[PDB]
C-alpha cells in the first residue's frame, strides 16, 4: 500500500542518513509537497504516534515510526538490488522504480530476495540495507503462523520459562520438538506435528512459542 505516511517516514530516515536535520521544510522540499500539506500530514502522523515534533521543530520518529521507516528503506533497497542485479533495469531508472516498489513489496518477497540475491549489504547506490535483522534474515507467534493449511516451519523459541501450565512440556519433549526444530503447523485448535507426533497446543503455548518461517 502506497502510504503517504510511509513516504514521509522514509524521507525522514533518508535525511537523517545524510546527516540532515529532518525539518519540515526540507521534507517538503524533498517530497515536493507544500509546507501546508506537510504540516497537515505531520499533524496526522503525530496522532498516530509515529513522529514527534521536537523543541527545535525537527521531526523525530518514535520507535514505532522508525521501525516502519526502516522496513520501507529495506524494501526499497532490496528492490534496487533486484532491479539491477536480476532485472537489469537502466541504472538511471532504478531509484525511481524502487520508490514505488517499496510500498508494495511484501516481507515474504524480501526474504526470498535475501535468498536469491548474491549480496544484500548495500544498495546499488552505496547505502547499507537496514532492518535485515528484523526481517528475520524472535519469530512469529504460532497463533499467527498456523493456518487451515499445514506447512513446515522452524521452531525458534518455546518460551517455557513464561509458562504457567506445564503439562504440555513432556509432549513437546516426546515429539522431539525443541528450539531449532523443523515441525509442521496448522490452525484448526493449533496442532504442530513432528516426529510423527501431532501436538495440539493450548492458548498459552500457541501465544508464546515463536516459529521462523521455512
Q: Which positions lie near Zn ion, rule CB under 5 A?
A: 95
Closer to Zn ion by Cβ: residue 125 or 162 = 125
Q: Which is nearer to Zn ion, 95 or 154 (CB)?
A: 95
Residue 190 beta carbon to Zn ion: minimum distance, rounded to whole angstroms: 41
3-state secondary structure at position 161: helix
Nearer to Zn ion, 95 or 207 (CB): 95
Question: Which of 23-40 are b and which e, b meaning 16 or more Cβ less than 10 Å from the residue's Cβ?
Answer: bbebbbebbebeeeebee
- Nearest approach, Cβ of residue 173 and Zn ion (Å): 49
The Cα–Cα gap between 32 and 157 comes to: 46
CB 123 to Zn ion: min, Å = 6
In angstroms, what is the minimal distance from the CB of 4 to Zn ion? 19
Q: Which residues contact 61 (CB under 8 A, 6 or more apart)?
A: 9, 12, 13, 50, 51, 69
Q: What pairs with residue 154 in β-bridges?
A: 182, 212
Torsion of CA 171, 165, 140, 130, to 10 degrees: -120
- Output the smallest distance, CB 100 to Zn ion, in A: 11
User: Which residue do the cell numbers 499533524 mark?
Assistant: 43
Residue nearest to Zn ion (CB): 95
Q: What are the two backbone dihedrals, phi and then psi, of residue 78, each rounded to the nearest 5 degrees?
A: -70, -40
Would you say 29 or 182 has its CB closer to Zn ion? 29
Q: Which is nearer to Zn ion, 109 or 179 (CB)?
A: 109
Amino acid at each position: 500500500l502506497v502510504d503517504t505516511t510511509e513516504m514521509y517516514l522514509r524521507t525522514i530516515y533518508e535525511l537523517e542518513e545524510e546527516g540532515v536535520t529532518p525539518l519540515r521544510a526540507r521534507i517538503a522540499e524533498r517530497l515536493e509537497q507544500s509546507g501546508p500539506t506537510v504540516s497537515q500530514t505531520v499533524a496526522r502522523m503525530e496522532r498516530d504516534g509515529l513522529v514527534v515534533v521536537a523543541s527545535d521543530r525537527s521531526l523525530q520518529m518514535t520507535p514505532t515510526g522508525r521501525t516502519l521507516a526502516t522496513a520501507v528503506m529495506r524494501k526499497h533497497r532490496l528492490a534496487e538490488r533486484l532491479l539491477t542485479d536480476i532485472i537489469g533495469l537502466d541504472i538511471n531508472k532504478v531509484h525511481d522504480e524502487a520508490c514505488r516498489w517499496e510500498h508494495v513489496m511484501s516481507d515474504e518477497v524480501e526474504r526470498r530476495l535475501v535468498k536469491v540475491l548474491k549480496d544484500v549489504s548495500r544498495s546499488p547506490f552505496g547505502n547499507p540495507i537496514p532492518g535485515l535483522d528484523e526481517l528475520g534474515v524472535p519469530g512469529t507467534r504460532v497463533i499467527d503462523a498456523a493456518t487451515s493449511m499445514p506447512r513446515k516451519v522452524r521452531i525458534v523459541q518455546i518460551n517455557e520459562i513464561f509458562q504457567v501450565e506445564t503439562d504440555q512440556f513432556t509432549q513437546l519433549l516426546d515429539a522431539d520438538i525443541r528450539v531449532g526444530s523443523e515441525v509442521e503447523i496448522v490452525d484448526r485448535h493449533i496442532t504442530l506435528s513432528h516426529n510423527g507426533k501431532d501436538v495440539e497446543l493450548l492458548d498459552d503455548l500457541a501465544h508464546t512459542i515463536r516459529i521462523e518461517e521455512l
